[PDB]
């Protein structure tokens, strides 16, 4: 009714090639957790914490130097008001324990670290993915969430064992709290990928991909969750599909949904809709680029970033402000 939108475009150069990006906001500053894993005879796996300074990423710390982990570990990063907690967990079954390396920091640069073990963890046989998250307040305590999803099911006797979360109330030291997710629209004979919780205004929701049998594409799904029992959430799907546009990412600004779309599965252009009304067009052409991988990074309830990698090493940062003027 009484809202306005402002956008600016900025660019960031990166000197290291990141196989995957994980952006987070710490004290209103943009950071990146960059997994660098070239497979050359001389190369080593790096997990850099980077910080935006001027128009370039500045590497602050290589977390991976502290661990003997092989492969590409799961990365679970959490931002509290003053603290950053990053977990590197072994990439996997027969074993019932998961070993993680916990990194802690009060600033963006200096990290303390130690090893933890989540013995007999209740996410056995669930698919885990890397993501950044916020604390979720249940009762009078705040929790960090590690959530997984069953990759595939033929028959589903219990619709509470499809999405399952492990929770910690001591800043990621111990993970003994089970949070039950009821998701009735979990489909049988369908493969699930890349489950990520989104937490905003102490509300829980999940963003993930679903594989398509007919066409060889992965479709974005988004479910919103309501808190019912203390440690139980029920989650239903939320439809964002629109014709001749492919759903990409979802976020919330000004207590409304903002949604990015691509024109096709190649993401030549990108459209961002605010409450499904006002839209802004992203043209990463001025060329040969695209807006694949575009994701929202929320700064506060009115300020958000939309980030995608134009070309190799270049990041397009669209800053979005959306609020009521009265």
């Amino acid at each position: 009714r009484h809202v306005f939108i402002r956008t600016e475009l900025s660019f960031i150069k990166n000197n290291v090639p990141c196989i995957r990006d994980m952006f987070f906001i710490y004290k209103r500053e943009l950071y990146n957790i960059c997994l660098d894993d070239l497979k050359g005879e001389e190369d080593e796996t790096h997990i850099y914490v980077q910080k935006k300074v001027k128009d370039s990423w500045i590497t602050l710390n290589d977390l991976f130097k502290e661990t003997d982990l092989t492969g590409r570990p799961h990365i679970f990063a959490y931002v509290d008001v003053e603290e950053i907690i990053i977990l590197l967990c072994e990439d996997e079954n027969r074993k019932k324990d998961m070993t993680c390396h916990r990194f802690y920091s009060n600033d963006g640069k200096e990290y303390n670290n130690a090893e933890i073990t989540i013995s007999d963890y209740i996410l056995k046989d669930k698919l885990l993915s890397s993501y950044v998250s916020l604390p979720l307040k249940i009762e009078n305590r705040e929790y960090f969430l590690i959530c997984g999803v069953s990759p595939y099911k033929f028959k589903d006797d219990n619709k509470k064992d499809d999405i399952l979360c492990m929770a910690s109330h001591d800043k990621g030291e111990t993970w003994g709290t089970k949070i039950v997710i009821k998701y009735d629209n979990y489909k049988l004979g369908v493969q699930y990928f890349f489950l990520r919780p989104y937490i905003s205004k102490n509300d829980l929701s999940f963003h993930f991909y679903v594989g398509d049998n007919i066409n060889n594409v992965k479709n974005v799904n988004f479910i919103e969750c309501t808190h019912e029992k203390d440690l139980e959430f029920v989650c239903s799907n939320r439809d964002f599909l629109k014709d001749n546009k492919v759903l990409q990412d979802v976020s919330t600004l000004n207590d409304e949904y903002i949604v990015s779309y691509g024109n096709d599965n190649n993401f030549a252009e990108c459209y961002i809709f605010f409450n499904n009304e006002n839209s802004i067009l992203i043209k990463p052409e001025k060329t040969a680029a695209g807006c694949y991988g575009g994701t929202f990074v929320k700064i506060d309830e009115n300020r958000a970033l939309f980030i995608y990698s134009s070309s190799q090493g270049i990041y397009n940062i669209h800053t979005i402000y959306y609020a009521n003027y009265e």
Partner: antibody, heavy 114, light 108 residues
Framework: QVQLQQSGPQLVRPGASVKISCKTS????????MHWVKQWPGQGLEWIGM????????RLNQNFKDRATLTVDTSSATAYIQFSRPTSEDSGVYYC???????WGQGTTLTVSA | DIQMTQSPSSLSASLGERVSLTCRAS??????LSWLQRKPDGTIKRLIY???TVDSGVPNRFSGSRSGSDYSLTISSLESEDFADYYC?????????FGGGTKLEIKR
């Protein structure tokens, strides 16, 4: 509950191939690099190298380039270090360790003498 | 290779004393320094990593610190258990390298 049990003492003559084992339990053997450290007789420690059991990739101190060879058997979760043509210089105590985890084996004494 | 020079190479002190071992790096190692204890029975234990973080299960009388190129391990109150050999270890650049070691003995 990680455990690293190495093999017992060995006395071999120069030029006779010798192999030291380190059997692991209580963790995913392929999830962690395995290091080897040498304790020199009457002196200090020296890092030999490390092996990735999942990739069979090796980072070796070049002071041991043509002396030691590291292998793994993921089926039995044991790491090996072998001296194909050992000399008197190779005598010492050899440790297997996940150095950046703090888990060390008890050490294996190797004596090379004619 | 990075040379770690460790001092003192030998040190004697009595029970309950405070001792401080210094390890100097020939180039920047960015705090990737560990302290290890080699007991008389040959067993090796990690005490400190990332220069000042005390490993779990290590008594609180152990601590580490850094001032520029110098890294130090400090034992505030010496106990009978603490008399053994000590090594620093840089794990910043391959190949990883140890200090020459410190043998700590009891003063009577």
């Amino acid at each position: 509950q990680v455990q690293l049990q190495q093999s017992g003492p060995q006395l071999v003559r120069p030029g006779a191939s010798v192999k030291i084992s380190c059997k692991t339990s209580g963790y995913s053997f392929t999830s962690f690099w395995m290091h080897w450290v040498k304790q020199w007789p009457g002196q200090g420690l020296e890092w030999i190298g490390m092996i990735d059991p999942s990739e069979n990739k090796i980072r070796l101190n070049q002071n041991f380039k043509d002396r030691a060879t590291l292998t793994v058997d993921t089926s039995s979760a044991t790491a090996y270090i072998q001296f194909s043509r050992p000399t008197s210089e190779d005598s010492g105590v050899y440790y297997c360790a996940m150095v950046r985890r703090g888990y060390w084996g008890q050490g294996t004494t190797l004596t090379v003498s004619a | 290779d990075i040379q770690m020079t460790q001092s003192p190479s030998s040190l004697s002190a009595s029970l309950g004393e405070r001792v401080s071992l210094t390890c100097r790096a020939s180039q920047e190692i960015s705090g990737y320094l560990s302290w290890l204890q080699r007991k008389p029975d040959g067993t090796i234990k990690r005490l400190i990593y990332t220069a000042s973080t005390v490993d779990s299960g290590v008594p609180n009388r152990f601590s580490g610190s850094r001032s520029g190129s110098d890294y130090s391990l400090t034992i505030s109150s010496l106990e009978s258990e603490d008399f053994a050999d000590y090594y620093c270890l840089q794990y910043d650049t391959y190949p990883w390298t140890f200090g020459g070691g410190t043998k700590l003995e009891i003063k009577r």
